[model samples]
Target chain A: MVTAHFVLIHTICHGAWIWHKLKPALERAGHKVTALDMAASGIDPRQIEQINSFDEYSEPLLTFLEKLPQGEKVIIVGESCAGLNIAIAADRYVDKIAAGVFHNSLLPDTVHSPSYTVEKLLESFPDWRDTEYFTFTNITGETITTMKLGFVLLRENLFTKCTDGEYELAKMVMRPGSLFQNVLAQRPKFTEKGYGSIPKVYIWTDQDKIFLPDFQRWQIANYPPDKVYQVQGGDHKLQLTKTEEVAHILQEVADAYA
Target chain B: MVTAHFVLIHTICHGAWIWHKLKPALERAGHKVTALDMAASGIDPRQIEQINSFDEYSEPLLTFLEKLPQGEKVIIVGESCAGLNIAIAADRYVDKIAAGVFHNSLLPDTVHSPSYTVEKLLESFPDWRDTEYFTFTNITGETITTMKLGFVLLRENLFTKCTDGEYELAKMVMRPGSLFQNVLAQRPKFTEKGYGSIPKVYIWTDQDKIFLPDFQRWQIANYPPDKVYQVQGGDHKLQLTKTEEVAHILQEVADAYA
Candidate 1:
């Protein structure tokens, strides 16, 4: 039996709360887990208006990885846009990462522009019904766009297979989030010796309504992970909808990489 | 079948997230629910230091009740320390209240000072093991005491019967909260015409650890309610630990008052 340390990063608009179910399940199996609220998301206290770039939003994960002991490594698991977070952290502290697991998330590659996947995602699923969009000027004077996910979308898409309690929990705590696609497009691509060199695992579900099936398949075809695990039937939030299964997959990632 | 609009207020240090489980359960029974984050609590965005008095902390609920249309009433359900919130709201909008239901909560009387129940709660459960306390000067230049509930206390006392996911959710979103006991003591007592005229219901569980049996018993004796419903074996968070039971009790409250 092998126990590993796992660092969990949530998607935009969500906090460490998204990992509530999975964290305990993994911990029950004797693994140490760290779930962080990204800057301006969850209860991090930083407003979106103050954050200028995706890198700034990824700061908490970067700082946590930076302070890791010289020779220690942990599996960095990300959901949705947090795959971008995994890429950002891996670029800075590749040696400190045992593997990068993408759960219904974006898969960044070294070939295309940083925002390639995000652009493709929008192209694949253009309609975000009832979600409200707003803009605010960032500290750097750049106009940043943010969206508050609508309940209809939350109920019909993101939390399709989740419980009423889980759906209501999302509605209660969700904050506005930005794709930061433009800023990401202008950023440097992931380096081969950094993010590209780390072991990648993609875990997804076909039942996800927000991150449509074709987009997830497209991401797998575009960059491809070191391994891919398709769970039978959970929605966008596999961690919440399918807790133990995700934990088991993470355990496998730990056994193989950590 | 009768339906009621229930406004849910959480205890200090907790946000509306505590009602994530109960909200849907009540709604499933066809009740309209509004769960709010008190000043600086939950993810309300205002830091605790910015808030001065308990009235300031209770602003969200007050504002919501103030805007209710003429002749519209709601059941304000409070948990733990939120009994104080019910009293405050009832004082301002007594006509807008159908009933005030206390769930393992404080029961304020027209006779005692505003902080009487809080003071008694502290006396009955003097030891808050491992919970960290700190103080900060508020906007009004008053030094306010706040406490971050420790995990040991959260695990063994507060969330004893809750699921790991529910407990983890609390840790993820829980903020520091103030009792504002001193400030409350200085305020005028709840008026009989205001808070006293509204129907009150006391809901409790004998197995609660933090708000122990004796304190709950004392609250019942101190200010007897129009009705009493004692549940058998849930912990401090009866809503999370005993969702259906609490919902059923709330249903009874609605049927009797709403």
Candidate 2:
């Protein structure tokens, strides 16, 4: 009789498309699922130039949580950089969050700058291969860096274990994304009573080329979660590569928290 | 040892994404494949309101053909409404087109109004089920009608035989699409020398719910293609449902035309 509402958040430059496989998998097991597009990502109508800060980019998630019925709680599952999204949402809607599940994602702590995990992530996996980068001034006039992920990088790094159709789907839907590192660095750290109080589950795979094994391990060590799930043999996109396994783990989260 | 370049075009609301399965299947057989996103469709970045006419919407295909290598002839494969795109591209670069392949698509003729097939399509399958419609003013101040294909419609009609992941992918990436029926009705009829001089092949299935069996048959009888292959039991997205079958048929097109 245990079922949970699972809200899926994608990484930067990606969209709700990434959860195409996982969403259905979870739904089949009798869970309510919601996958959202962050600002300027996926099929979201807003252009990257129109979004100023990381907070603005996280608006869709925040809004979704804001509209949740009273006393209803959800497990917010974030992949890659979306850990920041979970942290941001938890700060505003902690009472509404049953848990925050990080899938090969960042683990933000209350101890450092808001961009600490991202800075460390770049340092850990510096070479992006053929990925292209550019900058645009946002609506707030702050310069935002954006990236068009190269196909080679996509095939080799992110979608290594995914199907050709899945990889091509990524190429078709992926929009330019930014870490908003500079802007994020300027923001205050996550609070202990807010994000730190929520139950956290860290999920990762050693084969993740983009968010490498070392960095994922580092994040786990830096901000230890209430639980950890190290899935075997998947790449950066565990939801796509290891769909059922990830869903199984999420089921456990639902059983325990939701 | 037949290898041909195939340019893939998607329908109005869809993008290059629909070709994900078929493109690779063709590529694996050593054919060169180029799948493009039309203006305001897929990840092209242009909003629907900025696009004025059907010609403007077909810019990406025309631009790609404009820069084709000298004497290079490519088989253009259009799905659903993309038959309109194939006709538009052939008008200017008929020599660059080895053939036009219509996959469960509208087969536009030179004799009738440019929107004849679309008008006939609506007449045959009048109800879109839960599909929602809205209007927007284009750049040239013309009222444009757009529709968001409902999930129920997507499931029972378009993606009937496809996987849940594929269906979910459609919901994630599909933007609102316009048939531009009025604007197309205003345009001049396609020239016989431009479009009719090129070879045409029509591929379809009887199981298609949206394009209904009657309308598909009517289109073929209205303007017969040089070839027809009616595969049994697949739905509207033949590429996703019948990937290998469609790819094998395309291989035949390469051998015969390119």
Candidate 3:
């Protein structure tokens, strides 16, 4: 547990560069951290629009995980499509993974449609589907790029609690989240497979300007609420913006899991 | 939304003075943002022992909200005690609240307690809690000060995350946090009727020397999965150090809500 290393798996259109602020701070603090770039994002120059299916981007992440120093344990964290990698890696390398955290992700749950599961979990929340606030670009035009997200996503996914400036920046940094078209459109069915009772934590953006907060909660409720964690503050691009506060939480989770 | 204002709520000993860097950034971005020093903090000198309860501290915030200009909307960004005040304001004036963001806050669901939140919403993280890493301090007990921050907080929250140099300065600062004392033990129940409904966003730190990762995730889980938001880098003092990035996120979230 003392030798455990934290694993970072990124999603589409982003690379390890997204975590530049994270690497030095952790290393300076005397902890081992591994940030893996999925094949398509970062320097890969792959066109997200051309990629018909996801998962193919996980090649580098999977390969990297397989070769970790045996002495070092794992704290797996995934972003976007990379979230699937966090789960798969946990199942494949339970010994390596101490905990799996998915950030503002389209989570996996029961085989049922997203409605029944989402509705049941969101009974307490009445504003889950308010899409009247901002205007979103619809890229249903066979483009895989996540269209620009605006105030609408903030209210439902990240929460509406940010300053006006934050909203505009979120749109600029928000690489089109079209993956949701692929992620949510389908109902996921996990094989009640508990390789090990690893801790699973989820970060939901209550006023998510893009993704619906209710959607994120639905997944947590279906999974064990005990394993799920919630925090308030920040928008989708929070990684690049609020670094310290974010760093503290991630470190604490890694330490506790080990 | 266009007329929305931004109010920054800060922790104890620290006041709007700490936000000197953040002020220009928010203002330049075309938003009316103010880092309010709650009568006791900042240029306003008030002894730590003089104040007892969190609510007593929050009186200024409530007063601020009650006297807002007519038809003006607001986004309250809370840090430490200021976060509690933001929650209270959002509740009392729901219509005026554009959003409520909690930065490393007490995720007890309300401001009922003083300081008992362990929250995180980010899965992409790094470890920064290890006290032995930085060199920061203040100017003796009289001045409210901060350390550069590093790891010591990883194991415990009693100390500030600061560079050794800052540590020396911290000795100069009069108000330093003591474990199991002051707000830590005197905190109130964070669960009040209106607290839960205010949209919550969590920014988990991946490089926090204090308020480490574990405490972060705990906050998220307690706040419920939908309420948390995640940020990747920086430490407890990131809010002050990373001004440009912070400004970027502020604009983004604000624009989204707009």
Candidate 4:
């Protein structure tokens, strides 16, 4: 198998570790993998403090892309808002970006931003905001996802294909996320440039409660993709729960770019 | 159409043939159909042995006050346990009898019956004693109510309401099931009376693990019948799961009883 590299980015509320199941499988196949938590997410919540603008929100990835060794192209897998970074990476360095995989990631429509789309869906089910998010650490386990900013994170990144399991898992795994305030307070640039197109693949989970399936279908139809991979039995958190399948698909997709 | 009569007797753990769908349709058409468990199961299970003293079992039934004797005459449908009396009366008073429908209910319930529960609310998941009373055959395809049962009954009786979608198909067809004592402890009686009543229409669903729809058909075929009715997408608990439709069919049958 040709050697390849992978960067897995989770949607709002999820950490890079959501790719836990997929990592071993790809590594077993002789590929290098990096699962990243974007600034203000996962372990890097404090990193949000370093950003005052949208470019800064995605600067870490930009910095990494700028330093790639000659001829090395990385397949960026973005879930939810992570798609923003993947798109940005793709546009700025389309030559170095091999491909981008969207596991129900955001694709802002011409009419409105993804966040605006999501706030409307949540309007129907307000119970989702009832509890704080919590994760089990080595000892105590209380990860709260209710940081006021957490809502913004969700609104910005999540599309109509995230599974319920994934959303709930995010509620369970998130800490009092560091950048909750800043991420919530600021509006995403959400420009076409935010999603500079590289070779793109969108994976949709038909049963994702967080992202409505029809809406996701709408995105795929409107945005146009090289291909759309469907996750069977997927919920919003499908990329997390069915990570191995997602990874396998990514490997196959990465091959095309490679 | 042959002017035929259909009757379903209720027994311990069951009511009617559990063919809630057909019952109302037949009754509404001005035919005759009734579900009688006969052992007084709703009141006491110990009465199952009323067969040893059969007179006591048939007493109250004949003692009923009637306003219209013509309409009052019915082809007593002995379901499950009552199948015993159905058998005796079939040989003794064949003219008054119609057809017998044996769903998975050879004393089965829409839901599985716990040995103790029948004294109260009827079928539930059967709590096992792991005794000789439970033969291997009984354990495997026991009639128990769950969503598995609900979707099934819906598929059979309200088939048109379902889509050809794969997920609905799997849930309705392949999921869980009811218990066996619901069937076995009284199969002897069910078999005996099940074919009684003149012009018996033996009805059964295929893929039934409990009463095994095939078993119902096979029995009817061996003894001979005016005809039989077969449908799908329900379990032993069709009465409750799909009650409204069944009521209509039973009413239609009542109107047609001749």
Which one is best on TM-score? Answer: 1
Structural similarity to truth (TM-score) of each candidate? 0.99, 0.97, 0.40, 0.40
Query: Candidate 1's error at B224, in angstroms?
Result: 0.7
**Per-residue lDDT of model 3, residues A1-258, tens digit only:** 353476766655445544545555565556687776565443343444544434445666667768876855677766544555665455556666677777665455435543343244335434524333222333444433343334475434553554443343333223332343433345343323532356776765554554456556566666653355455666554444454555666777766786
Query: A78-135 in candidate 1: lDDT tens per residue?
Result: 9988999999999999999999999999998999888998898889878999999999
Rank by TM-score (best first): 1, 2, 3, 4
Best by DockQ: 1
Model 1 ranges off by over 4 Å: none
Cα-based lDDT at residue A67, candidate 2? 96
Q: Candidate 1, DockQ to 2 decimals?
A: 0.85
lDDT of 3: 0.52
TM-score of the second chain for every model: 0.98, 0.98, 0.69, 0.47
lDDT, candidate 2, B1-258, per-residue tens: 589999999998889988888888988999999999998888888988788888989999999999998999999999889999999989999989999999999999999999999999999988989999999997777799988888899999999999999898888888888999999999999999989999999999999989998899999999989999999998999999999999999999889989
Proportion of native contacts found in each model? 0.76, 0.70, 0.00, 0.00
Clash count (model 2, backbone only)? 0
lDDT of each: 0.92, 0.92, 0.52, 0.47
Model 1, residue B75: C-alpha shift (Å) = 0.3
DockQ of candidate 2 relative to the true structure? 0.75
Provide the TM-score of the second chain in candidate 4. 0.47
User: How many clashes show up per model?
Assistant: 0, 0, 127, 65
The CAPRI class of candidate 2 is medium
